[PDB]
Every structure is written in C-alpha cells, then in structure tokens.
C-alpha cells in the first residue's frame, strides 16, 4: 500500500508504490476510486484517476490491483453489460441500491457465487497444449460457452471432473514444470494487449447481413472491418441493427462510448428488444453488450473498444464468428485526444495523438480470420464494424482517414438518400469495397453462375446513371437516346428494388444469397433485352408501353417468400416472351 | 553483455536505469519482464550513472524491482546470408515464414556506412522495368533514387508488384537482385505481395521484408534500413545488381513522428521532424554505384501523397533527396487507365543518364522529347477544347487532342500484368508518333525518323 | 492556517497542514479582520495550496489567519428555495430570510446509471416555432444553444424559460437558471424579466457576476444542477435548467488550470475539457422509479465565430441536438436569429408522433428543410448573377426562403406560439409549392 | 559532405569553403564560390538549437540564423588585400536556399535575400514545361542591373 | 428613445437604411461576376442610394469644425433627405421611368445633400428645398 | 504607394496658411481620385475598355500619369515647394473643372 505524497486534481503520486507495475489499475484514498498508473519514480507512482478526487488528502491509503487493465473472461459474462472497463451496470444497481454511480465502489466483472454447470469432454492424462478445451460451459441457450487452457500453462491434466462449480473454484489440476497447477474456469487477458493465435489467414469468405446492396454492392468478408457515416437519420441504428440480427455470426459484440444519456439509454433498451429469427430468443443472450456514457471514465471509453475486441476475441480463439459494433469510434478518439491532453504530450493533428494511426492498426488488426491456438486447429474470425461521427462536417477528420485506411470497406450513409426514405440509406458511390473482386470467386462457384458479371453490370448503370443525372439538368430527358434513356429506366429498377428495401418486413428485410441473385438477374435481364429491342424496332416509349405488369412485378419480385424461390425467378420467362410480343 | 536488474525510473515509453557504465549511443537495449516476456529497447544517451532506453513495443505491464535490463553492446543488426534470397523477414529482421532458420556469415550495422563520394561510380543501366511510358518519358536508372508518389484510392501497390516481376537485366540474368521492402502495410495487403510474388515465381529472385501496420514504429522505422542492408551486401559483396522498393513511405514518415512525438522532440513544419530530410537522406543516399565493385542498388521509395498535395513534407523533402519526379494523378486513374502515370510533372533525373542514353535505342533519346512536347501540347489542345467550342480549335491543333488521348489509351497502360520490351516500347512510341506529319516532328533528325514510321 | 509560507497572486501556499482535502475549501482572515475564502486545487505533503477567490489584495501572511472548514463546495437544499435568487455559491444577493432548515449537498453529485436512466418521452413547447417543427425538443434531453458574440442569446434564453411548458404534466415547469460570468446588464435582465412576468417565484436563480471568482464562476454551474437534481430526483418537481454564459466556464477553467500551472490542451482549453464538460452536462433526463424530470439547455458563446473551437465541438458530442445562430440572420433584423439547417435535434422524434404532436410533423419538416434548403441555394445563385438566369421553380423557391425566415423563421422573442399554430403557419408557408412536387400521400387533409 | 555524413560537419564545410576562396581572393584573383545547398546549413543548425534546448525564432531554426547568413554572405565582395601591394581580389558567391513546398516564405530565403544583392528565382511550372533556365524574368530581381549596363 | 423625441421612429430610418447597405454589400459579390452597368434599375439605385448615404453619412471631416460635430437634430434631417431620395426616386421606378432618366438633371439637388452635412447646425435649411426640391425635380420626369 | 500610406500631422504642419493654402484639399481629391482611378485601371483589365464607364476611364488614365509623373519624381531629382503645388494641380484639372467638387469655384479660377 502506497501513502499519497500528493493529490492536485487528476493527478496522483503515491509513496511506497515501487512494487506496482505499470499501467497498472489501483484504488485511491478512504473511497478508493479507480485509477491509473503510467510512470513510477521509484517508489513513487503517478497514478492517475478518472473518478473525482474531490475529499481525497495526503495520507490516504493506496491499493494496486497488482495488473494492467483486462477483461475478465468466463461463464455469465454473455448477456451481461458492462461498462468500456467491463464493470457490470446491472449488478451494480443491484449492490448500490441506488441508481447513481458510486465512487470508490468496485464490483466483480463475472459473478462468482453464480454457479454454472460444467461437462468435460477431455480424458484424464490427455496432453494439454496452449488454446486447448477441457470442457463446456453453457450460459446462454443460444451460445454455448467454451473453456481454453489458460495462456501460458502447459502439463499434464491427472484429474478430470465434470461438476457443479463456482468459476472461482478449480474445477481440474494440470500439471505443470513448475508444479502442479489448478485452472479457474474464470480467465483474465489484457484488454490492451492482442490474443495469442497460431496462425492468421486471409479472409476470402464473403459474411451476409441479409441487405442486398451490402451483399452484392459491397460485400464483407469474414473478420472484415468497415466503417459507416454517423450523420443522423440515415437510419444506421436501423443498419447496425440489422446487421446483428441477420448476422451470420454467433456473437454479436456492441462498443464504443459516450452515447449521449438519452442517445445511450436507447440502445440499452432497444437492443435487448432485438430477437435473433433463428434462435429465437433475445438477442442480447447471444453476446456481451458494453455502454458508457460521456460522463464515465476516460479510459473506460478510450479503452471500451479495447475491452469489447478482446470479449469477441476469446469467443473468437473458441472458433466461433464473432462480431464487434463500435458507436462511436469518433467518441473513443475523442476520448483519446482527450487522454493526450492530459498526458501533455506534443499534439499531433487535429489535437489527437500522433500514434493515433497506431492505436486503430490494433483495435482494427486484431479482427480477421485466424487460427485459434489448441491442438484442434479451430478457426474463429471476428467481423468489426466501426461508426466514426467526426461532427466536422470534413472527411479529412484524422479518425476517419486512418480508419480508412486499414479498413477494407467504406460504407456511405447519406442523409440526402435518408430523406427521400430510401432505405437502406448507403450510397453506392459514396461507398467503396476492394473486397468486392475477392466476393466474385466465392459467389460464382457457390451460385453456379457468374455472379462478378452481374455486379460489375450493375455498377455500370448505377454510374451511368450519374453520368446521365448532369445531363438531364442541361437537356431533357427526351432529347437524350433512347439507348441513354433506357439507362435511366434500368437504374430505376435496381434502386426501386435491389437498393430501397423495407427493414420492417422480415421476407423484405432479410434476402437469401439465392435470391439475391435472383432479384438482380430479373433487372439485369430486362437490360439486355429492352436494349435489344430499342436498337431495332420498336421505340423507346412502345418497350415502356405494355411493359407496366411484367415491370411491376419485378417490382414486387422482393417480397416473394424464400421458400417459393422459383417463382420470382420466372420473371425471365415473361420479358423473354413480351419482347417477342413487341415484334409485330 | 551486460544484465541489470535495478530500474530507477519509468515514465512512458522511456525508462532510466540508474548505477550503468559503459552504455553506448544508439546501443539496442533488452529487457526481460518478470513474467519472462522480453521486449526490445533503444537508448537514446548514456549520461554517467545513468541508463535511459526507449522501449519499442512499449511500457506497459512492467516492474521496475522485478525487471531486468540487459544489454547487448551493438546498434540494431541484421545477419546476412547469401541464400537469404526467397525468405521473408520481419522488421526485427526474423523470417515470418519460420523457414529453416537463416545462418549469417556476418553481422552489420542496419544504417551502413556512407559511400565515398569520390569512390562513388555514375550509375550506367537501367532495367526497363515495368510500363514502357514510364520509361520512354523517363529512363529509371541503375543505382539511381527513384520518387514514385501515391495517393489514397490510387493502386500505388499494384504499380510495385508489377515492376517487381517486370524489372529484368538484358545482360544476364544470372546476378540479378530484387529487394521488395514493405512498411506499415495491412495483413491482407502484405498478403497481396507475398501471394503476388509466389505466383510470379518471382519471389525466389528477390528477398522480402514484411511490415504490419499493427507492429512497433520503431520496427517500422528500422524495416528500411535493413532491407538496404541486406541489398547493399549483395551489390557491394555478391556482385548482383540489386534493386529495392518501399511502400507507405509516409507511414516510415508517420511512425517517426509518433517516435518523435514520445521523445517530447520539436515538431518541424506540418508537424513531420524538422530534420526529416536528413533522416530520410541516408536511406534514400544509400543507392548508388561504387568504382571497382561489380552491380549497382537502385531505390523506389513509394510514398503516398495526402489530399492529392505536391508540397507536403514528405513528397516535397523526397523530391530533394531522391533523383527524378513520378507522379500519378487522379485523372487518369478515373479513366481505369493502368498504370495511371502523368508524365508532365514526373521527370527522372538524369533520364539521359545513364539511359540510353542511346543504349536504349538509335533515336530513344530524341524520341522521348518530341513525344513530350506533342503532348504537352495534346493536353493544352483538349483543355482549350472545354473553354470554347471544340470546332475553335485549329485543324492541325485537332490532331494533337486526337494524339492526347491515343497517347493515354495505350502509352500510359499497358495493364497491370502484361510487360513491354524495350523495342516494343518504341515500335509502339513510333507508331503513336506517326500522326503528326513528318515536318511537324521537327525536334528529331531525319536518318532517324526516314528509318522509323 | 494562520501560517502561511507563499502568498502569490490569487492563490496562496500553507505549510504543515494535515488532512487537508482536494476541493476542500478555505477560510481565510485578514490582518485587518477581513474574511475571504477560497477552494483548494492541490495540497502538498507539507503544504497546501489555495486560491482565494475574493483576492489576494491587502493581505499579509504572517498577520493572516487561514481555516479549513472541513468540506468541498456545496449548496443547502431546501424546497422553499424556490423564487429566490443567490449568487454562484447560495449566498442569497436578495438577501431574503428563507432560513432553510435542511440538509446539505456536494455540489459535484455522482454519475447517472446509463442502464438506470430513461428517455425523454414527453414533448415540450419551447415557445419557438423555430425549434419545436425545424428541431424537436423533449423532456429530459440536453438541448445546447450556440451563440455567437453580440448575438441575441439572452432574450432567447429568457424567453424558453417563460414559454417552455411541459405537455399534458398538469404541472409548472420549475427551472434553474444560473447566471454565470455576464454582465450587470445582461444580469439585471434575467431577474427583471423573472419579476416582470412573476414566474421568477416559480425559479430558482443563481447569479455570477463577470467581477466574480473565476473558481466561483466554475462552481455555480455545479451549484446550480445540485439544486436541479434535488427538486428532480426529491422533490419530484419537473425540472428545465439553463445556463449561461458556458463560454465564461470554458474560460474560468483555464484561469484555474493555468494559476495550478498545467500544460493546457489543444486551443488553450483544459486536455480534461471533454470529462469536466461532460459531468456539468451529464447530469440531465428521467431517472427510473422518479417522478422528477431534468430538461438541460446550454447556452455558449463561439470564440472567433468557429464551429469547430472545442466548446461547440465538444458540447456537441455530450449535448444532444444542435442549435445554431447565424449573425446574418440577426443582421436581418429578425429575431430569433439561429439557422435551420445548421442545428438538428437526435432525439427528436421521439416527441414527435400522433397525441404528443401533429403526426403529419415528420412529412412537414422534411418538406420545409427540403424546400428552404434549396431556397439558400437559390439565394446565393441568383445573387449574383442578374437576371433571370435562374429558373422559373428557383424563384419560387427563393420567395419561400424569405417568407419562412421572415415570418416563421423569426416570431420574436415577446411572442408565443402554440404547436397547432406553428405547424398551421407551416402549411400556408409551405402551400405556395405545387401539389404535385413533393411529402405525404394524404397532403390533402392540412391543405 | 553527402547529406548522410554529419548533419552539423554542413555548418563546417561552408566556413571551410569561404575561407579557402579568401586565401586566394587574397592573393589578387577574381574567385566564384558555389555551396549548394545553403539551405541545408541551416537545417543543421535547427537540429542543433533544438536539443540544446534553446528558443527557435521562426519556422525552428534559430532566431539568429539570419545572421550567420549575413556574416558568411558579407565576406563575399570586392576587396582589397593586405600588404604594400595592395592587391585586388573579388568572391562572388552563388547560393541557392531552396524554400518548403517552392514557398518564398521559408525564413532562409528572406533573411538571405535581403543581404544578397542579386535575385534568381525559378518556377515550378516553367520547370514543368521542362525548359531552362527556369528562372522568372518578373519575378526575380536584380540591383546590379543598373551597375551593369554602363 | 429616440422615437419619443421627433415623432418619428429612429427604428424605420435606421432599419431601412440599415437594409440598403446590407443589400449593396450582397449587390458587390453580384458587380463582380457581371458588368457593373448591366443590373435592375430597382438594384441600380439601391447602389446610388447607398453610395448616397456614405458620401452624406460617415463622410464627415475631423479636421472640418462643421462636418466634425453634427447636432442631433441635424441628424434626423440630413438622415431623412438622403432617405427621402431614395423613396422618391423609387416610386419614379414604379411609374416606368428608366434610372438614367431620372438621374441626370439631379446634380444640382444631390450636392445639396452631399454638402448637407457641412452647413450651420442652426441655421438649418439644410436643407428645406431638398425636401421638397427632390419632389419637384423628381415629379418633372 | 501612396494608398497604404497617410501622415498622422499632415494637418498640422500644413497651413491655409503657409506653405500651401490648397494643399489640405488638393490632398483629398488626389487621394480619392486615385483610389477611384486605381479601381477603374483594375475593372478595365478584367473586362476592358468596354465594359468601364466613360467616367472611370478618365480617373484611370488620370491614375496612371499619378504614376509616370506625380508619383514619382526621380531618386537624383528636386521639386521646389511652389512646382510641386502646380504639378499636382495640373493632373487633377485635366479633368473637367466642373467635375471635382472638393476645392472651391474662386480658388481654381
């Protein structure tokens, strides 16, 4: 225990503090608020504090957690939420009996005395190596938790037992060179510092939320970051949401901090509404949620996306998909340039830290598809997904550009498109997806047909569309070709349809792989068969003409069951028969 | 080799270790945590009774009682081997491939010693290498600097993969060295090089270092000096004409200012080291040709230019310290015209020389000029074309806008995976240059434009 | 102590003291037997340091006697506090006998539970069409108001206050208002205003004059929220706060931050800036199982006219909603002056929607910000070239930009609007327009 | 000296450099000294004030730097030599100071300006255009012009 | 205040004029892109009445014993003259007539109002046909 | 330059009085025509002749001679007090006397 030499606002230095180590969480006076130590003299420790230091003297008592900040990992941490450091909210009500938060009053992130059953599935005497899983523990009924031998531990298990037990309790011995050793189901990691893999691979598997543009016009590989607009209603609550709940993966992971109380608190409450289709229970069992508000702790907001990665990391080295929804990164930096302020280190640009790049190459490096460690060689890939709101209205904000950057995929919210309705609000040239070539192999061989030609096609239009959108404003529409002019109508379709899609409507919210394909081929159809057909022949306005049934049930072709998949594929049939039809 | 396991003081990356002597500049550092994990370290100055070293990976989680600070009397070192050819090696210099462990004969300081200028040789070759455009309009040279600039959305990475398996020697190729240096780079976009490199079969030929985004920026910082290093030995001792490529630079520019900015050292202009241009002098000075050794090291350092601007620190202080201008503009990359290049504001300096400077061929050197100034003025025709009504333009004029663009459509690509020959270069330059009449090529002589058509 | 080793400008240094807290304040005795007190930032082990917020003016060490006084800043809370205006630190200016017998309160309180708090889900007029149908206010969300130096902010400030009434409560909107750093003027304003309409019984008032303590001045936006929250969170009462000149803390803080020496942060403010900001704003929306209701609106004064200075930057990330004035539209003459397009409220959709408010709200807004956004764009075109180079819609459009910011834009700041006028006025405005360019499919029922 | 040799051996090689050209300027002969770059003698002095710790008057180099530039340009001139014989020898000294970015608002342009009486100022279009000299006829300026012409 | 002691609004004059110098401020952005020559007789003479008010307004002379104390009285009536110009002038507009038409022949009446300025502040006078003189000289087109 | 330039006591040096008794108004209109002529020399490259009026066109032409005579003297030459006076007037009265209203009707005559 370290005596405070002295206390002056934020910062603290404390005597006696030489066994300490760095970085190094501690508590501070009579309250023992939650604090941070960066530097040592030694003895004497500048720990720093988040929570007020207000009644706090020379002479109070210093407690050092004896560890830098880590998650603790381990049955009942799923379905829980806890704060960017992981203390849990909800338990905390419970033991403050009060609904504001105390200062100098610390909870335990998992609950020990909660007992989870445990089934061991190894044998006794089997070797044990480093990722290995002894047993399962199933605290959710959508997710089934898995125990990985403790990093650095290596021997011979003698014991093996499957019991009701506390995590704090050993449910086996393992030997080890040292001696023998008991493993706590409980595991504690830093946040910080990256998890331990055997191998990492590059993520060629396309990851389907179920929304058409996002699939088809900028897919998401396995592990895949993107980065999203936080401009307001562009309905990317509506997205993200979307995302979680139509996601491939088994766990969705929420971070990022400081929501706004009341922009905060509706996520705390909407999200738990979310019921995944497939489980169908809340689909808040299935992951961890972490929510702070502005007021909390600097570092547990600049660290909260720390401490969210490395929940999706463990679930991650269990080789299950996870994913990470981080709102706002731009807040996390925020806190950042923040945290630098007060470090007092040199500014870098747009006040932030100039190892800012190197904080988002971490977070953002650590998601992908990897070889977990253990025997078994599992893979897990944990698919992040960052909202930035910079608020400067540039697109030159330090936080988005090196984002950006290490990221694979731009996504375009855009406020425009969100008041004319048009759902989902992305704009498809606004956005960008390098991603999207890798997609073409993995769909042309899972479709049977060539899905690259399909999409590369659709670009085309869409772009031409921008192209034909200046000219329009200088000449009518009429005085362009009817060539130009059925580029208008074929645009058309594909927004009406493949880019406006109802999040409300489950058949139209969530779209098949096969179906997609399905939706775009009827648009893409017409194309070929319209141009065609206004090359020689008929006109431009006859192909519209008597074209309004066969049209309009494309239009409609999206809110076809997924079932009756063959049905909205007969559209073919149809504009095959009704260009015959124009011919007289 | 020398292990103390008392630290006086820790404060941020920088850690002092009191009661030391014989400490060094610039004398890597290590020290073992309790737990046993070992982290890499740079002292900056050893003053008397005093050890003050800078800890790359950094700081936290360490326990100055129950730490231990060895050290290991050298600056920051990369073994060599001959056969290090074909294996791929982490900025700490350890082959991530974890490949047969590689046996160096010798160890050497990663920053090298400087060439002698008087023992210097004038570079004499160039690799053709690459897009014919680019070296028809300027010739790269052997063991010459060479300044490519890139911008975000720009496919800079591309142009360096292609060059890497387009880049051949005419004379023989049997001593011939290709060195790819990667820097700040992601995982999958290293993984382009690596899968790119194999592909080609090309990696063989050339010795790779790999950079992760995610690594320590002083192991970023130290990547391309010890690719130098390693290219240096197999130019100045194996004889092999070596030729090295950084990517990112601006991450190299980027990582040393958030070392710099540790250090509490005064930000220079745009927040970049004022002394950046030193810094990035002897890396970029290091290529070259020595008089009595065999092969040559030729550089292109790859930086990417941000917001599309010229004067910015790096492009700008680049520009001093490397020989020649390559330029990439947003333009042509619009068109999907690859490799996107703009050849008015990018120069190699000397083109001449070494290139040909008839070497290359009988009338390239006259050649390459009277194609620049048919479209500088191709590109002054069409933009008078967007002013007034593009029927004001003057028959004669037309046919340089027409000249322009068929310039662009084939000269300035030629894809990202097809290679042109020297002779095919020109053949096709020849061609292009036919449009205008024969009195109209005036800069070039007449044996030489009577025997091409 | 009457022992004091250094006395240097505002702050002061005390030697051999023991137990001595941070933010614990002082009492200090003069020579003379002048008495002045003043708020402790840091204490050394042997000594400690304060700085006295009346001055270090005729005051000399050996002969001055310093005392603790055992506790951080706070207010005694009481419920007949109501209608009674005190200076930054409670002591009453009116000098009024309230005698208040309860207990006391700290005025830096503690952190709202995100989990534990509830959103705002009543609507509340804000007396300004301006900000009810362009933006959409309600109870229980932070509501910041950007003001630019020389602009109207503080008849806008008075004038929610008076005209702001919660929606079907059935109760008296009870507010805070905390005067800090402003001018007599600007001061005498706020309590005549109060007097004048008699709500000022209704209010709880604390004032800080620009003369004031700088530390005085950073505490009374504390002070003033202790009292805020007392009457939410015990009393039960609905309770609106607001609070300016922000600018004037923003500034005080640095005072203080510079006389204890620390490096200050990007564009000279505190690095801690966001954290301090935030806890002062934090505090503000429904608290589960409570009857009592927080409505926060901030009011800051731009530096230099600049979105991006820290104060606005920040504040827009802790606070909720953007509300923006331009100088021109003061220039105008037109009162309210703030832009439309510029400020946008979150949360306000919340409030908006069938009973609370005119459901077809959400189509109206769309249609005015579409239509008047492009009427700028007109605007700035059409300026500058003449005539007749814009198009026959342009000019239309242009005729609705003047008309919504001459009319609806700006209904003075005497003036009250109920919902049903503003969105009433909003239709005939918005008639001008074809039917057919667009909106609603039942655009037919309001006109 | 390469730039990779000592940054601080720049300050060296140009006091070196004008003293040699002195001892034969000395002697009676018309000599021409050529440091390129000066530019970069006064990086090496910025690299110097700041880890000593010391204040930077603009753009970080130290706040005497203009004179330095003052007293080596001051030596280059017309004079007369020491002894009965009264010799004459004539330095003239070209040094080109290139500015950040082609910007005339590097401080080593400036304060070397002022004291050099003769302007050459190329342009980084003309350059681009690829014909030399690229210097700017209008922009640069010349005092001997008129010291020149008779 | 001031309203309460002429029986005219300081407000209206102040506010109106206030509105013809933001206008030519708005109108120069306007002068840049296009000839200064070519723009509405209605805008046209905004920019003569604004030039008008700081060649009568803001043009006083320091060093000039008369133009550098103006008496408050003084104020209203020189304020009034050069707005009443403008007014006038407007309603010629309004009538069809073409801006140069009604500007020529008005040199003799405007250096009244330009000099208004510098005559006695008691004498007045300053002037008395220039309310009426206007009228009459703009009535005869 | 003669615009960024102007002497704080210019006034009280100067008499009405000795040395100049028109030297207080002579300065107003050389300093305002050349200002307006200065911004009539500026309108007429961006648009030409055509585009200026007749009237700026005289102040611009008059703006120049400002230059090529008045503005500069010479750096070996010497102006009495009394030529400098007559210089100055001459340049403004090539203009219409009618059209400069600063000096007085007796004192041009």
Same mark, same amino acid.
């Given at each position: 225990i370290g005596k405070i030499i002295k206390v002056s606002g934020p910062l603290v230095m404390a005597e006696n503090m030489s066994e300490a180590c760095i970085q190094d969480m501690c508590l501070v006076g009579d309250l023992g608020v939650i604090g941070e130590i960066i530097e040592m003299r030694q003895d004497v420790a500048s720990i720093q504090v988040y929570e007020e230091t207000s009644g706090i003297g020379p002479g109070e008592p210093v407690r050092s957690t004896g560890e830098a900040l880590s998650v603790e990992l381990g049955p009942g941490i799923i379905s829980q939420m806890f704060d960017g450091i992981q203390r849990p909210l909800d338990t905390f009500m419970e033991v403050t009996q009060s609904n504001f938060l105390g200062r100098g009053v610390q909870l335990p992130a998992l609950d020990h005395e909660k007992q989870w059953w445990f089934e061991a599935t190894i044998e006794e005497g089997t070797e044990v190596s480093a990722g290995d899983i002894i047993g399962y523990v199933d605290e959710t009924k959508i997710i089934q938790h898995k125990i990985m031998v403790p990093n650095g531990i290596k021997g011979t298990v003698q014991k093996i037992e499957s019991g009701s037990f506390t995590i704090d309790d050993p449910i086996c011995?393992?030997?080890?060179?040292?001696?023998?050793?008991?493993?706590?189901?409980?595991?504690?990691?830093?946040?910080?510092?990256?998890?331990?893999?055997?191998?990492?691979?590059?993520?060629?598997?396309?990851?389907?939320?179920?929304?058409?543009?996002?699939?088809?016009?900028?897919?998401?590989?396995?592990?895949?970051?993107?980065?999203?607009?936080?401009?307001?209603?562009?309905?990317?609550?509506?997205?993200?949401?979307?995302?979680?709940?139509?996601?491939?993966?088994?766990?969705?992971?929420?971070?990022?901090?400081?929501?706004?109380?009341?922009?905060?608190?509706?996520?705390?409450?909407?999200?738990?509404?979310?019921?995944?289709?497939?489980?169908?229970?809340?689909?808040?069992?299935?992951?961890?949620?972490?929510?702070?508000?502005?007021?909390?702790?600097?570092?547990?907001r600049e660290a909260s996306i720390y401490t969210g990665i490395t929940i999706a990391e463990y679930f991650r080295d269990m080789g299950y998909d996870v994913a990470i929804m981080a709102d706002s990164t731009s807040r996390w930096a925020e806190a950042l340039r923040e945290m630098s302020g007060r470090l007092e280190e040199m500014p870098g640009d747009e006040g932030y830290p100039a190892y800012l790049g190197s904080r988002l190459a971490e977070y953002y490096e650590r998601s992908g598809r990897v070889i977990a460690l253990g025997s078994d060689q599992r893979e897990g890939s944990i698919t992040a997904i960052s909202a930035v709101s910079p608020s400067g209205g540039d697109i030159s904000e330090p936080v988005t550009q090196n984002t950006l950057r290490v990221v694979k995929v731009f996504w375009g919210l855009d406020s425009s498109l969100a008041q004319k309705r048009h759902f989902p609000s992305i704009n498809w040239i606004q956005s960008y997806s390098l991603y999207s070539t890798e997609v073409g192999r993995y769909m042309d061989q899972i479709l049977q047909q060539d899905w690259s030609?399909?999409?590369?096609?659709?670009?085309?239009?869409?772009?031409?569309?921008?192209?034909?959108?200046?000219?329009?404003?200088?000449?009518?529409?009429?005085?362009?070709?009817?060539?130009?002019?059925?580029?208008?109508?074929?645009?058309?379709?594909?927004?009406?349809?493949?880019?406006?899609?109802?999040?409300?409507?489950?058949?139209?919210?969530?779209?098949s792989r096969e179906k997609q394909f399905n939706m775009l081929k009827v648009i893409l159809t017409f194309g070929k068969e319209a141009r065609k057909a206004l090359s020689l022949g008929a006109y431009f306005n006859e192909i519209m003409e008597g074209t309004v049934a066969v049209r309009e049930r494309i239009s409609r072709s999206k809110y076809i069951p997924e079932e009756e998949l063959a049905k909205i594929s007969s559209i073919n049939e149809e504009i095959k028969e009704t260009i015959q039809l124009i011919v007289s | 080799?020398?292990?103390?396991?008392? =630290?006086?003081?820790?404060?941020?990356?920088?850690?002092?270790?009191?009661?030391?002597?014989?400490?060094?500049?610039?004398?890597?550092?290590?020290?073992?945590?309790?737990?046993?994990?070992?982290?890499?370290?740079?002292?900056?100055?050893?003053?008397?009774?005093?050890?003050?070293?800078?800890?790359?990976?950094?700081?936290?989680?360490?326990?100055?009682?129950?730490?231990?600070?060895?050290?290991?009397?050298?600056?920051?070192?990369?073994?060599?081997?001959?056969?290090?050819?074909?294996?791929?090696?982490?900025?700490?210099?350890?082959?991530?491939?974890?490949?047969?462990? =590689?046996?160096?004969?010798?160890?050497?300081?990663?920053?090298?010693?400087?060439?002698?200028?008087?023992?210097?040789?004038?570079?004499?070759?160039?690799?053709?290498?690459?897009?014919?455009?680019?070296?028809?309009?300027?010739?790269?040279?052997?063991?010459?600097?060479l300044p490519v600039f890139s911008g975000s959305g720009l496919p800079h990475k591309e142009l360096?993969?292609?060059?890497?398996?387009?880049?051949?020697?005419? #004379?023989?190729?049997?001593?011939?060295?290709?060195?790819?240096?990667?820097?700040?780079?992601?995982?999958?976009?290293?993984?382009?090089?690596?899968?790119?490199?194999?592909?080609?079969?090309?990696?063989?030929?050339?010795?790779?270092?790999?950079?992760?985004?995610? #690594?320590?920026?002083?192991?970023?910082?130290?990547?391309?000096?010890?690719?130098?290093?390693?290219?240096?030995?197999?130019?100045?001792?194996?004889?092999?004409?070596?030729?090295?490529?950084?990517?990112?630079?601006?991450?190299?520019?980027?990582?040393?200012?958030?070392?710099?900015?540790?250090?509490?050292?005064?930000?220079?202009?745009?927040?970049?080291?004022?002394?950046?241009?030193?810094?990035?002098?002897?890396?970029?000075?290091?290529?070259?040709?020595?008089r009595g050794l065999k092969g040559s090291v030729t550089q292109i350092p790859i930086l990417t230019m941000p917001e599309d601007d010229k004067t910015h620190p790096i492009p700008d202080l680049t520009g001093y310290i490397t020989e020649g201008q390559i330029i990439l503009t947003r333009e042509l990359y619009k068109s999907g015209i690859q490799p996107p290049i703009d050849v008015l504001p990018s120069l190699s300096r000397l083109k001449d020389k070494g290139t040909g400077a008839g070497k290359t061929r009988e009338d390239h050197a006259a050649t390459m000029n009277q194609l620049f100034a048919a479209?500088?003025?191709?590109?002054?025709?069409?933009?008078?074309?967007?002013?007034?009504?593009?029927?004001?333009?003057?028959?004669?004029?037309?046919?340089?806008?027409?000249?322009?663009?068929?310039?662009?459509?084939?000269?300035?690509?030629?894809?990202?995976?097809?290679?042109?020959?020297?002779t095919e270069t020109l053949d096709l330059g020849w061609e292009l240059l036919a449009m205008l009449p024969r009195t109209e090529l005036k800069r070039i002589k007449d044996d030489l434009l009577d025997k091409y058509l």
């Open positions: 011995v393992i030997e080890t060179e040292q001696g023998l050793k008991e493993l706590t189901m409980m595991q504690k990691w830093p946040v910080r510092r990256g998890r331990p893999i055997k191998q990492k691979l590059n993520p060629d598997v396309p990851m389907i939320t179920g929304q058409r543009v996002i699939d088809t016009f900028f897919p998401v590989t396995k592990g895949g970051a993107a980065a999203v607009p936080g401009p307001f209603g562009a309905g990317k609550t509506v997205v993200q949401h979307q995302i979680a709940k139509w996601s491939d993966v088994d766990l969705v992971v929420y971070v990022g901090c400081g929501e706004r109380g009341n922009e905060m608190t509706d996520v705390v409450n909407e999200f738990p509404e979310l019921i995944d289709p497939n489980t169908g229970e809340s689909l808040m069992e299935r992951t961890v949620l972490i929510a702070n508000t502005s007021n909390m702790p600097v570092a547990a030609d399909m999409v590369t096609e659709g670009m085309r239009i869409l772009q031409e569309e921008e192209q034909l959108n200046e000219i329009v404003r200088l000449v009518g529409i009429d005085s362009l070709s009817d060539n130009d002019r059925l580029t208008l109508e074929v645009a058309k379709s594909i927004r009406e349809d493949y880019l406006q899609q109802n999040a409300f409507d489950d058949v139209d919210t969530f779209t | 080799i020398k292990e103390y396991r008392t =630290i006086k003081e820790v404060v941020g990356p920088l850690m002092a270790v009191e009661k030391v002597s014989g400490v060094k500049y610039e004398e890597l550092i290590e020290v073992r945590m309790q737990n046993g994990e070992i982290r890499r370290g740079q002292v900056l100055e050893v003053q008397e009774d005093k050890a003050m070293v800078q800890i790359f990976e950094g700081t936290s989680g360490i326990c100055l009682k129950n730490s231990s600070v060895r050290f290991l009397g050298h600056p920051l070192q990369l073994g060599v081997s001959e056969d290090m050819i074909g294996r791929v090696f982490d900025g700490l210099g350890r082959p991530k491939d974890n490949g047969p462990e =590689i046996l160096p004969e010798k160890y050497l300081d990663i920053n090298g010693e400087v060439i002698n200028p008087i023992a210097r040789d004038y570079p004499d070759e160039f690799i053709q290498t690459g897009i014919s455009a680019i070296d028809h309009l300027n010739t790269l040279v052997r063991g010459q600097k360096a993969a292609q060059i890497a398996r387009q880049a051949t020697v005419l #004379d023989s190729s049997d001593d011939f060295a290709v060195v790819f240096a990667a820097i700040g780079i992601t995982f999958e976009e290293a993984e382009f090089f690596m899968e790119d490199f194999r592909q080609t079969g090309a990696i063989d030929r050339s010795v790779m270092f790999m950079n992760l985004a995610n #690594d320590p920026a002083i192991e970023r910082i130290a990547t391309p000096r010890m690719a130098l290093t390693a290219a240096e030995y197999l130019a100045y001792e194996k004889g092999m004409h070596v030729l090295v490529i950084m990517t990112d630079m601006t991450n190299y520019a980027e990582a040393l200012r958030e070392i710099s900015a540790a250090r509490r050292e005064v930000p220079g202009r745009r927040g970049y080291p004022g002394y950046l241009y030193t810094n990035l002098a002897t890396l970029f000075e290091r290529a070259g040709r020595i479209y500088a003025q191709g590109k002054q025709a069409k933009e008078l074309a967007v002013v007034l009504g593009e029927s004001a333009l003057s028959d004669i004029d037309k046919i340089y806008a027409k000249f322009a663009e068929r310039f662009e459509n084939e000269y300035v690509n030629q894809g990202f995976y097809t290679n042109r020959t020297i």
